[PDB]
Amino acid sequence: RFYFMYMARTTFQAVRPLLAFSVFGEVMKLVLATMSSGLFSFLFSFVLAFEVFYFFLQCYISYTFLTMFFTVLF
Amino acid sequence: YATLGSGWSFSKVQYTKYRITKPWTTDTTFDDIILSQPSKEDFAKFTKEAPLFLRFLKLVTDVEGRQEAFIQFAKRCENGLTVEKDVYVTKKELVDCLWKNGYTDTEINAFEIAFPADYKFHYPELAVLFDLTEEDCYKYCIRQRAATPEELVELKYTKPKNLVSSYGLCFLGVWFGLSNTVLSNAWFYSKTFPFGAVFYMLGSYFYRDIREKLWKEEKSLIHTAQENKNMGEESVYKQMKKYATDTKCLDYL
Amino acid sequence: PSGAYRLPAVDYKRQLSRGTLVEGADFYLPTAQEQQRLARHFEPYSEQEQEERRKFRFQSISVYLAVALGASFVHDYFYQRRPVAWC
Amino acid sequence: KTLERNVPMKEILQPLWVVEPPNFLRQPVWKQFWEAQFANRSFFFFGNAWTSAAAFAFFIWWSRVFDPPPKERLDRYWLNSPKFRILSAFHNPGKRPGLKISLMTYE
Amino acid sequence: GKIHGAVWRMKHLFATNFKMVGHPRYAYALPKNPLLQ
Amino acid sequence: PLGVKGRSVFAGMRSFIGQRLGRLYDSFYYSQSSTKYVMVFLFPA
Amino acid sequence: SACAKSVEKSEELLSNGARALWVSCSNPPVWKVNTNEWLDSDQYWQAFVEKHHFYSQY
Amino acid sequence: MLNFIPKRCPSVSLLFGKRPVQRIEVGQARHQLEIPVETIEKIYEGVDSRLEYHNKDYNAMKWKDFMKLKLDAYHLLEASQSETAAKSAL
Amino acid sequence: VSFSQFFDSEYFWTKANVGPFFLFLFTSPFWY
Numbered sequence: 001r002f003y004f005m006y007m008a009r010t011t012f013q014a015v016r017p018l019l020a021f022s023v024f025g026e027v028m029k030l031v032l033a034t035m036s037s038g039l040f041s042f043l044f045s046f047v048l049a050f051e052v053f054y055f056f057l058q059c060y061i062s063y064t065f066l067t068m069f070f071t072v073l074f
Numbered sequence: 075y076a077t078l079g080s081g082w083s084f085s086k087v088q089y090t091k092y093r094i095t096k097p098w099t100t101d102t103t104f105d106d107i108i109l110s111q112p113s114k115e116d117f118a119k120f121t122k123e124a125p126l127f128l129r130f131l132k133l134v135t136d137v138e139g140r141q142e143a144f145i146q147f148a149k150r151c152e153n154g155l156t157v158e159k160d161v162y163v164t165k166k167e168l169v170d171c172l173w174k175n176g177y178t179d180t181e182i183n184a185f186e187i188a189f190p191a192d193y194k195f196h197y198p199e200l201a202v203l204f205d206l207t208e209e210d211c212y213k214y215c216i217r218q219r220a221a222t223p224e225e226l227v228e229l230k231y232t233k234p235k236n237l238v239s240s241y242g243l244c245f246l247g248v249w250f251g252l253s254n255t256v257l258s259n260a261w262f263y264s265k266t267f268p269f270g271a272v273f274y275m276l277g278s279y280f281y282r283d284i285r286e287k288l289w290k291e292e293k294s295l296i297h298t299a300q301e302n303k304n305m306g307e308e309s310v311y312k313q314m315k316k317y318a319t320d321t322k323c324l325d326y327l
Numbered sequence: 328p329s330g331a332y333r334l335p336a337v338d339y340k341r342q343l344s345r346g347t348l349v350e351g352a353d354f355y356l357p358t359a360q361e362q363q364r365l366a367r368h369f370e371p372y373s374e375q376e377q378e379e380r381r382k383f384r385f386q387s388i389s390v391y392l393a394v395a396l397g398a399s400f401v402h403d404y405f406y407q408r409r410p411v412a413w414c
Numbered sequence: 415k416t417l418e419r420n421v422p423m424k425e426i427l428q429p430l431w432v433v434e435p436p437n438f439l440r441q442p443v444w445k446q447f448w449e450a451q452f453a454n455r456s457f458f459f460f461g462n463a464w465t466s467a468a469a470f471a472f473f474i475w476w477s478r479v480f481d482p483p484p485k486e487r488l489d490r491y492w493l494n495s496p497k498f499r500i501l502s503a504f505h506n507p508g509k510r511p512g513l514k515i516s517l518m519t520y521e
Numbered sequence: 522g523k524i525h526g527a528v529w530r531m532k533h534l535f536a537t538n539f540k541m542v543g544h545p546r547y548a549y550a551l552p553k554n555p556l557l558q
Numbered sequence: 559p560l561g562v563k564g565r566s567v568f569a570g571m572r573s574f575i576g577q578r579l580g581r582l583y584d585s586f587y588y589s590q591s592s593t594k595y596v597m598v599f600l601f602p603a
Numbered sequence: 604s605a606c607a608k609s610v611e612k613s614e615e616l617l618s619n620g621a622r623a624l625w626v627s628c629s630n631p632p633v634w635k636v637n638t639n640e641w642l643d644s645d646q647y648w649q650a651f652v653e654k655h656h657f658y659s660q661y
Numbered sequence: 662m663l664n665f666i667p668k669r670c671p672s673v674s675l676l677f678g679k680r681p682v683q684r685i686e687v688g689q690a691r692h693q694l695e696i697p698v699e700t701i702e703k704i705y706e707g708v709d710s711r712l713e714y715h716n717k718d719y720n721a722m723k724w725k726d727f728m729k730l731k732l733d734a735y736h737l738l739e740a741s742q743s744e745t746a747a748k749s750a751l
Numbered sequence: 752v753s754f755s756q757f758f759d760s761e762y763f764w765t766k767a768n769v770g771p772f773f774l775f776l777f778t779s780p781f782w783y
């Protein structure tokens with residue numbers, strides 16, 4: 001069972017950035033497709049920037065957990 | 075290209091939003107020597123006043139015992155010396171060379187009292203003054219100018235080239251590159267502009283912190299190297315000075 | 328068992344008690360010519376060896392390109408062929 | 415004498431070689447790879463060295479998993495593939511290969 | 522890149538010392554100084 | 559000094575196989591009875 | 604004779620020291636110098652790099 | 662010190678042997694030191710011309726001679742650092 | 752060269768060229 005647990009954890013930590021980049025991207029794309037005015041767009045630019053920062057945070061977390069999971073003593 | 079120069083000063087530059095400006099000229103243009111890779115004919119020419127140099131040359135030639143050279147050079151140079159403009163060696167560099175190569179204090183003081191501080195010696199002057207070849211003097215001047223490449227050099231102005239073909243190719247470029255929805259894409263607005271703008275803002279806001287954090291190690295290494303060099307040289311010098319008086323044993327014996 | 332085919336080693340604890348354990352050199356140097364380089368101080372590399380070494384001051388992007396093109400050609404047109412419809 | 419030759423700048427300033435990177439080891443790549451085999455923890459694809467990555471790549475290439483499928487298995491993935499469809503359309507310029515693809519599946 | 526950084530530091534920290542003709546762990550192999558006594 | 563005169567590479571192979579088999583028998587003898595029989599006969603079989 | 608020989612070898616020592624000082628003062632700044640050129644000039648530190656980075660990978 | 666010997670050609674080192682003496686500045690205080698040009702030229706007998714660095718203005722010495730020079734420097738330096746050093750090089 | 756004196760250890764590891772032999776050994780599956 002430990003092998004299954006480990007592979008699950010590894011795959012989750014590996015796909016975390018892909019999710020942050022793809023599904024939240026689809027949400028942003030829905031919003032872009034639906035919005036027309038200028039005030040809402042001005043306010044949504046900051047959401048896009050926050051998504052940038054969140055993607056970088058997820059990438060850092062994944063890097064940390066992956067260097068923990070792929071570190072061998074011998 | 076190699077980084078020429080005898081200086082240990084770790085120097086970095088910060089840029090402005092203004093371009094370098096030089097006095098207007100209808101025939102010349104200023105450019106970087108390493109980026110242009112100019113030739114002797116690409117260099118611009120001008121006329122320089124002789125007398126101040128011809129007097130010193132007559133003196134040196136009367137001392138050395140070669141007056142045919144002075145006569146020939148004076149007959150060549152009358153009405154001014156026509157020479158490439160930005161191929162020269164400064165008085166300070168020349169004095170350093172003389173001193174490190176063993177010219178006497180009398181000759182060095184003669185140079186100093188004869189020429190102003192901002193005088194610029196060109197390769198024909200150097201050749202006729204040291205009995206060398208103008209080719210070698212030209213190469214030396216070029217190396218000494220490349221050692222200080224922040225100063226632009228003056229070349230002959232040339233009209234642009236291949237403007238018609240360049241126009242055709244640029245039209246083709248726009249015709250194939252703007253006939254698309256790239257600059258209006260959801261990908262653009264979601265990734266390209268946000269990521270790029272965030273990188274640009276962070277770089278503009280931490281422009282100096284980043285540079286300093288990167289250059290810390292190099293500065294420390296350069297400091298360490300210079301300190302080691304100095305201490306070793308000083309120790310060796312003082313020890314040889316201590317042992318300098320070990321030759322008189324023979325003449326005493 | 329007789330003992331001829333015994334394990335050719337002693338446990339690290341017993342070695343440590345004997346005062347025999349060594350820990351280092353994840354790598355090794357096979358030849359004495361290579362072992363005594365840092366000790367010679369005057370001829371770390373023979374003249375012939377120096378002349379041979381001077382041929383690898385840079386990596387050969389030309390050889391890289393040639394080998395990569397050859398391998399790509401082989402891999403694509405001998406090992407990775409797939410059918411295509413014809414009308 | 416006077417100077418008349420047009421002296422190029424390449425006779426004076428020599429540019430450094432930066433196109434292909436330096437080899438501080440002064441040893442070829444295959445010799446590096448061979449040396450790594452006898453070093454501890456770098457044998458073939460064990461370890462996390464570059465040689466280990468290279469050997470793992472060669473191992474998966476030498477395996478069968480990345481080879482093309484047989485004719486008995488083409489219609490599992492390949493005949494419904496975007497690459498296959500685009501290539502068929504491209505190499506049959508003004509035609510429609512749907513019918514020929516159906517017949518290839520039948521075959 | 523690791524090798525490049527290592528050599529780049531070795532340059533600055535060794536090439537101008539006058540005390541590191543080689544590595545200290547191999548100083549036993551150097552000739553003896555005629556000035557010491 | 560690689561190889562010896564009068565000896566054959568096939569004899570060397572035979573000697574190496576003998577060494578391997580003897581080492582395997584020694585390692586199987588000096589092992590836990592709870593694990594070795596299972597892991598060596600029942601799971602493989 | 605022996606005094607002359609001792610003076611000769613001491614002068615050789617001091618001349619080598621002066622040559623070393625001249626070489627040092629005429630050398631370019633080591634941070635301006637190219638790294639691979641320095642390593643090509645130096646043959647001892649080549650062996651130091653090969654030992655720890657060619658015979659090992661970690 | 663580095664194994665970079667300047668080429669004595671005038672296109673590189675203008676006025677090398679025009680006079681019988683060389684001069685150098687030493688240390689942070691920049692003490693002056695004069696050296697005979699023959700003592701200097703002794704180096705260009707070990708200089709190797711196959712090797713040229715730093716815009717092809719510096720050759721390299723043979724490692725034997727360069728390391729002998731470094732060893733003399735190191736001996737002088739360690740003698741300076743020590744206190745039981747000999748009062749003479751005889 | 753004879754079979755025995757070729758497969759002798761000394762001649763096989765010092766003077767012989769085992770290149771073709773080991774190439775045939777590696778490619779055995781192809782020939783089979």
Ligand SMILES: CCCCCCCCCCCCCCCCCC(=O)OC[C@H](COP(=O)([O-])OCC(O)COP(=O)([O-])OC[C@@H](COC(=O)CCCCCCCCCCCCCCCCC)OC(=O)CCCCCCCCCCCCCCCCC)OC(=O)CCCCCCCCCCCCCCCCC
Nearest residue numbers: 232233234235236237238239240241242243244245246247
């Ligand atoms: C398989 C199926 C497909 C097959 C078909 C393929 C079709 C290919 C078509 C051919 C064109 C190929 C593409 C290149 C185009 C040229 C681009 C170019 O050079 O321009 C830069 C050219 C250079 O200027 P620059 O780059 O700014 O500065 C450089 C200096 O000019 C300095 O320049 P320079 O010193 O290097 O040269 C100067 C030259 C520049 O003049 C030119 O523009 C060159 C044009 C030459 C075209 C030759 C085509 C050859 C292939 C077709 C064969 C036709 C048979 C004729 C054979 C040649 C013998 C007569 O002439 C002059 O400027 C005036 C002085 C005249 C001196 C004598 C010149 C003739 C030399 C003798 C012939 C040499 C033949 C070489 C052998 C070729 C072997 C393959 O300036 C121009 O742009 C010229 C104007 C552009 C031409 C088009 C004018 C508008 C007309 C448009 C056509 C109508 C619209 C289309 C509708 C058509 C409906 C039917």
Ligand SMILES: CCCCCCCCCCCCCCCCCC(=O)OC[C@H](COP(=O)([O-])OCC(O)COP(=O)([O-])OC[C@@H](COC(=O)CCCCCCCCCCCCCCCCC)OC(=O)CCCCCCCCCCCCCCCCC)OC(=O)CCCCCCCCCCCCCCCCC
Nearest residue numbers: 386387390391394395398402442443444447468471472475
């Ligand atoms: C038909 C019979 C059977 C087939 C055999 C066909 C013929 C081969 C026969 C056997 C070999 C030749 C035998 C006669 C040699 C006689 C001449 C001689 O003695 O010396 C050789 C002769 C002269 O030697 P030399 O006198 O010492 O002087 C050499 C020069 O100074 C230059 O020295 P250097 O230090 O400057 O080295 C230059 C190096 C420069 O250094 C480098 O290698 C840096 C670049 C490395 C790239 C990453 C390496 C990945 C390696 C994967 C390898 C497996 C891939 C799977 C294979 C299929 C690939 C499609 O460039 C290379 O030559 C290596 C190229 C490696 C192949 C490129 C693979 C593609 C890389 C893709 C990377 C990009 C990925 C993103 C793609 C997306 C693009 C949009 O030159 C050579 O032939 C070099 C041999 C090249 C062998 C590959 C390098 C070793 C890499 C080991 C990888 C693991 C392989 C595991 C082996 C199998 C397991 C045991």
Ligand SMILES: CCCCCCCCCCCCCCCCCC(=O)OC[C@H](COP(=O)([O-])OCC(O)COP(=O)([O-])OC[C@@H](COC(=O)CCCCCCCCCCCCCCCCC)OC(=O)CCCCCCCCCCCCCCCCC)OC(=O)CCCCCCCCCCCCCCCCC
Nearest residue numbers: 334335458570571574575578579581582585598599602603
């Ligand atoms: C039907 C019922 C089946 C049930 C089983 C029945 C019985 C059948 C026999 C047993 C079969 C299972 C074998 C298990 C052995 C390994 C696992 C184990 O538990 O061993 C522990 C057992 C006890 O070890 P220990 O108590 O922990 O410590 C003592 C040391 O082992 C003591 O070490 P040492 O000081 O005595 O000597 C050092 C030792 C080192 O052994 C070890 O300590 C670890 C060995 C590493 C194992 C995994 C390596 C995988 C490497 C990846 C390969 C990549 C190749 C890439 C090539 C690229 C080039 C293109 O040397 C070796 O023996 C290894 C040599 C083979 C390694 C080959 C790797 C490539 C290098 C090539 C070298 C040149 C060829 C050899 C030439 C020799 C002169 C003729 O190990 C041994 O007794 C010796 C190691 C095993 C050697 C192989 C023995 C023959 C196996 C024959 C297998 C064929 C089966 C097919 C049968 C037919 C079916 C149809």
Ligand SMILES: CCCCCCCCCCCCCCCCCC(=O)OC[C@H](COP(=O)([O-])OCC(O)COP(=O)([O-])OC[C@@H](COC(=O)CCCCCCCCCCCCCCCCC)OC(=O)CCCCCCCCCCCCCCCCC)OC(=O)CCCCCCCCCCCCCCCCC
Nearest residue numbers: 458476477478574575578775776777778779780781782783
């Ligand atoms: C033990 C510790 C760890 C040691 C690690 C050592 C590291 C080196 C390992 C060697 C590297 C290769 C290993 C790859 C993984 C193995 C599986 C594999 O890849 O192949 C799968 C492949 C089957 O996969 P598949 O899913 O069925 O796919 C079928 C396709 O047709 C697929 O076939 P295909 O149509 O695509 O054609 C290619 C296929 C087809 O290949 C064949 O056709 C097989 C038949 C070829 C016969 C050629 C004539 C040979 C004449 C005999 C030579 C003397 C052999 C002496 C014994 C072997 C010595 C190593 O072969 C290959 O794909 C390449 C494999 C052959 C590469 C050469 C490797 C030779 C082994 C070198 C080992 C050296 C070091 C060993 C370590 C020593 C320990 C100290 O293997 C086979 O086809 C059968 C293997 C041969 C077994 C026959 C013998 C069975 C034993 C009972 C026989 C009864 C008499 C014996 C009684 C015993 C006396 C007491």
Ligand SMILES: CCCCCCCCCCCCCCCCCC(=O)OC[C@H](COP(=O)([O-])OCC[N+](C)(C)C)OC(=O)CCCCCCCCCCCCCCCCC
Nearest residue numbers: 559560561562565566567568569570571573574575776777
């Ligand atoms: C075929 C595909 C192989 C590709 C992957 C493997 C790597 C490719 C390189 C070849 C692999 C084999 C390298 C063997 C190196 C050992 C050489 C050596 O001298 O070892 C010491 C032995 C023992 O020597 P010795 O002890 O008798 O006498 C010499 C003593 N000393 C060493 C002290 C001087 O020498 C040999 O006899 C040669 C052995 C190698 C030949 C056999 C190859 C082994 C691989 C097959 C394993 C199965 C064996 C049973 C085969 C039965 C055949 C019917």
Ligand SMILES: CCCCCCCCCCCCCCCCCC(=O)OC[C@H](COP(=O)([O-])OCC[N+](C)(C)C)OC(=O)CCCCCCCCCCCCCCCCC
Nearest residue numbers: 581582583585586587588589590591592593594595597598
């Ligand atoms: C591309 C492929 C690359 C991958 C490499 C592929 C090839 C190499 C793969 C090897 C990896 C797997 C190796 C695992 C080996 C584990 C097996 C094992 O060790 O057994 C468990 C036992 C377990 O012993 P243990 O239980 O005492 O201790 C094990 C470890 N602890 C202490 C933590 C529990 O191991 C042995 O003791 C014996 C091992 C050697 C014998 C191997 C089997 C052959 C035996 C034949 C002799 C039969 C004699 C019969 C005589 C009867 C009368 C007495």
Ligand SMILES: CCCCCCCC/C=C/CCCCCCCC(=O)OC[C@H](COP(=O)(O)OCCN)OC(=O)CCCCCCC/C=C/CCCCCCCC
Nearest residue numbers: 010011013014015066070470473474475476477478479480
């Ligand atoms: C984010 C986590 C991602 C982790 C995913 C990493 C997957 C690693 C697992 C792959 C290695 C597994 C070892 C399998 C060995 C099986 C036993 C064995 O020896 O069989 C040999 C057998 C060869 O036999 P034949 O095909 O018959 O040879 C014929 C020769 N012509 O080996 C194989 O089949 C090769 C197996 C290929 C594995 C699949 C490749 C997957 C690609 C992975 C690379 C992509 C990057 C992966 C992320 C890196 C994670 C560290």
Ligand SMILES: CCCCCCCCCCCCO[C@@H]1O[C@H](CO)[C@@H](O[C@H]2O[C@H](CO)[C@@H](O)[C@H](O)[C@H]2O)[C@H](O)[C@H]1O
Nearest residue numbers: 401404405406407408409410481482483484485486488
């Ligand atoms: C310039 C000369 C250089 C020398 C290069 C020599 C290399 C020769 C090695 C060729 C080995 C090719 O090995 C072969 O690859 C092809 C793929 O293309 C495979 O081809 C397989 O898939 C294709 C496509 O589905 C089908 O035609 C069929 O199912 C089958 O042939 C073979 O199953 C395999 O046996």
Ligand SMILES: CCCCCCCCCCCCO[C@@H]1O[C@H](CO)[C@@H](O[C@H]2O[C@H](CO)[C@@H](O)[C@H](O)[C@H]2O)[C@H](O)[C@H]1O
Nearest residue numbers: 405406444476773774775776777778779780781782783
């Ligand atoms: C640098 C030193 C190198 C020393 C080692 C030299 C290696 C020599 C062996 C490599 C030569 C090619 O090796 C051989 O290639 C062919 C084609 O891939 C393979 O052949 C295999 O695929 C082909 C094509 O499907 C089939 O026809 C064949 O039935 C099958 O066995 C062999 O299984 C392999 O043994």
